């Protein structure tokens, strides 16, 4: 068809648009947490490294 | 399509939504899983400077 | 685009995997186990290959792929395999199936694979190697991934590959080791070089978000700050504004500007300012309104930080220095109007040395941009102070300015021109 | 400025078109009912086929024919001379659709 | 869309400053060819910026020009006084 087809291209499209979307954002915010978790893992590593060495 | 027009937008509401929360449940118990590791690994450090401590005695 | 339609298709042939449930053409347990969490909707039914305890579920089809040569049955079988391996949201996941008394040949086995681009065992092998970023397995050679030809005959240059690719690349960019490890080959130079080249909206776009990714670590950005990369991002900013890619740029810049390890490598925003003005771009984008609380919110950061870096750049001092070793060139501070303004006392120097500085360059300087830089900034100063005219008139500066109103260029005659315009003053 | 001129009237008139229209809340996108020739629907479609080709989104730039409920208007083709009276008989008023 | 036409309407109001200018420059304004093929990119903001400072360099010039000539006249006054 010419009509039904276009409309099929166009949710393509769109669909496939969303799909990229969905992608970059997913990994957007995956990447935001792992910053948290890293700077989260640096605070406490220091808070551990000073009883480390108090009881050393 | 016309329906399709607002399944789009459910779709995109329903994962960017759903990878928000799951971003700020991930950092909420990494916060503490964290902290369990280091902890953990922090006391294990410490047997082991004690049984060296002990080889140095 | 074609390679998702193409593993559809093969999705849609239905392997026979019963009449080689003989072991001599296809393993004859692991084709039984295809029977088994054949219902793959449920995960209750996933668990049914951790029955199989991974040898078995998929294992036993490493360096099966080779033993079945034939083109159309080891992609069908591949592609199977890797469709399953593809959605991987709780298959595997912690690696469950890794060879675990294959180790030494884990990451090897793909290296016979990453060929055969058309049948498109290059991506089925593009996401076996993405087990990085998650999977809990990491890459024992990087050579063997980074330099090899998967992603360097693919980034500089058929295109959905290269978007294929690239998407695996963001993945593999996602571990901060391994990121380090892909800055430690020429990848860093790759993507540059075909970010100048010519290609399709998406894969520069990833290529950017490589660069994103790229400017998480706070010594890496001061590491990439010895290559130009802004000016190819600013370019493709402005020429283009999809409100996609500009997302991207935008947080590439704002993570670059927000590492800030060092002041002599924060000074990145006046680098920006100098070889393309992007603040005008992040007025038109201000201007307008997007649904995206993110892209606002890193336009007003880069914007503010940018109107901090050119009010620290606006000091007297910055400009004594320039005019004291005649490096005169325009800019920020050549143009601030509170250093014109409130600083006009400062440029009332002892003895009034700098504007005898400005007089000899008036004589000296045979560039013409310093020399238009020269008149302007005489304008200003008997413009914000009348009173120094009559002492400039007594160096012969004025009269140096009657002299270049007729200079050999355009640029130098104006400015001259406003100069002694200004000059003329109650006179 | 003399190149200019008419191109800024352009812009604005342009400006004021995507100003008059249903921006799509859904989606960044635009849909918007436009009065055309029938025979001409093709051309548009070239048209359409143009603009996609300039863009990089590479959209299919649907052509629906609308049922409009409302009044179809009324147009007649005209040349160098029938133009007058065309002008005249819509000076008394213009004809009911399709009379 | 607002801001857009905003922005068009004072560079075209600008654009009828220079060309009152002009008429009174007495130029021929030909405006003849390569006007309708409208091209249609983002820096024309760039160019609007670029007119509506010349026009700003005319302005600041017309009026430096008036106070030069009004102190060039009251100088030759002077000088013919003695």
Redesign the interface.
């Known amino acids: 068809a010419l009509?039904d087809a276009?409309?099929q291209?166009?949710?393509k499209?769109?669909?496939?648009f969303?799909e990229?979307?969905?992608?970059?954002?997913?990994?957007?915010?995956?990447?935001?947490?792992?910053?948290?978790?890293?700077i989260?893992?640096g605070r406490?590593?220091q808070t551990?490294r000073l009883?480390?060495m108090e009881?050393? | 399509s016309q329906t399709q027009g607002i399944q789009q937008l459910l779709q995109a509401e329903k994962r960017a939504a759903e990878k928000v929360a799951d971003a700020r449940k991930r950092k909420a118990r990494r916060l503490k899983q964290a902290k369990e590791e280091a902890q953990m690994e922090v006391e294990q450090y410490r047997r082991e400077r004690e049984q060296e401590f002990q080889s140095k005695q | 685009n074609i390679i998702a339609a193409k593993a559809a298709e093969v999705r849609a042939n239905k392997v026979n995997w019963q009449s080689y449930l003989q072991g001599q053409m296809i393993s004859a347990e692991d084709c039984e186990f295809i029977q088994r969490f054949e219902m793959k909707r449920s995960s209750e039914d996933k668990q049914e290959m951790l029955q199989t305890e991974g040898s078995q579920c998929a294992k036993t089809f490493i360096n099966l792929m080779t033993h079945i040569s034939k083109e159309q049955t080891v992609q069908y079988i591949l592609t199977m395999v890797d469709d399953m391996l593809q959605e991987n949201h709780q298959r595997v996941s912690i690696f469950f199936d890794y060879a675990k008394r294959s180790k030494s040949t884990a990451w090897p086995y793909f290296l016979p694979m990453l060929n055969r681009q058309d049948p498109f065992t290059v991506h089925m092998a593009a996401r076996i190697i993405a087990k990085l970023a998650a999977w809990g397995k990491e890459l024992m050679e990087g050579s063997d991934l980074n330099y090899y030809f998967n992603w360097i005959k693919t980034q500089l240059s058929s295109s959905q590959y290269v978007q294929c690719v690239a998407g695996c690349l963001q993945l593999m960019l996602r571990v901060n080791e391994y990121r380090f490890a892909w800055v430690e080959a020429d990848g860093v130079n790759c993507i540059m070089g075909v970010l100048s080249n010519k290609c399709g909206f998406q894969l520069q776009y990833q290529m950017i978000f490589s660069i994103w990714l790229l400017a998480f670590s706070p010594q890496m950005c001061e590491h990439l700050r010895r290559y130009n990369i802004i000016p190819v991002l600013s370019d493709i900013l402005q020429e283009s504004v999809k409100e996609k890619v500009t997302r991207i740029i935008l947080a590439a810049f704002r993570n670059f500007l927000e590492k800030s390890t060092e002041r002599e490598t924060r000074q990145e925003y006046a680098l920006a300012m100098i070889q393309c003005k992007v603040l005008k771009q992040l007025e038109n984008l201000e201007q307008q309104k997007y649904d995206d609380e993110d892209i606002s919110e890193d336009i007003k950061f880069l914007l503010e930080k940018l109107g901090e870096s050119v009010q620290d750049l606006s000091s007297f001092d910055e400009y004594s220095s320039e005019l004291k070793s005649g490096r005169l060139e325009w800019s920020p501070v050549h143009k601030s109007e509170k250093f014109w303004r409130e600083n006009a006392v400062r440029l009332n120097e002892k003895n009034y040395e700098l504007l005898k500085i400005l007089t000899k360059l008036l004589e000296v300087s045979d560039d013409p941009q310093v020399l238009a830089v020269a008149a302007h900034d005489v304008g200003e100063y008997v413009r914000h102070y009348p009173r120094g005219k009559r002492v400039i008139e007594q160096l012969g500066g004025k009269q140096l300015v009657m002299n270049h109103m007729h200079h050999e260029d355009q640029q130098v005659r104006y400015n001259a021109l406003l100069a002694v315009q200004k000059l003329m003053v109650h006179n | 400025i003399r190149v200019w001129f008419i191109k800024v009237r352009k812009m604005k008139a342009i400006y004021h078109t995507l100003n008059l229209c249903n921006i799509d809340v859904t989606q960044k996108c635009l849909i918007a009912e436009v009065w055309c020739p029938v025979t001409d629907l093709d051309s548009i479609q070239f048209a359409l086929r143009r603009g996609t080709e300039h863009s990089g989104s590479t959209v299919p730039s649907i052509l629906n024919r609308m049922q409009t409920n409302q009044t179809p208007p009324t147009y007649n083709k005209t040349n160098k001379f029938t133009h007058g009276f065309q002008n005249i008989v819509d000076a008394y008023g213009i004809g009911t659709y399709r009379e | 869309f607002v801001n857009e036409v905003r922005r068009c309407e004072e560079m075209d109001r600008k654009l009828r400053f220079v060309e009152k200018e002009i008429r009174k420059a007495n130029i021929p304004i030909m405006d003849t060819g390569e006007n309708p093929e409208v091209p249609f990119p983002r820096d024309m903001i760039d160019l609007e910026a670029n007119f509506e400072k010349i026009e700003n360099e005319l302005k600041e010039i017309n009026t430096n020009q008036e106070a030069l000539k009004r102190n060039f006249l009251e100088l030759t006054e002077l000088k013919f006084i003695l």
């Open positions: 009509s276009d409309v291209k166009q949710i499209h769109m669909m496939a969303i990229q979307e969905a992608n970059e954002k997913a990994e957007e915010i995956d990447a935001k947490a792992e910053e948290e978790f890293n989260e893992k406490l590593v551990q009883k480390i009881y050393y």
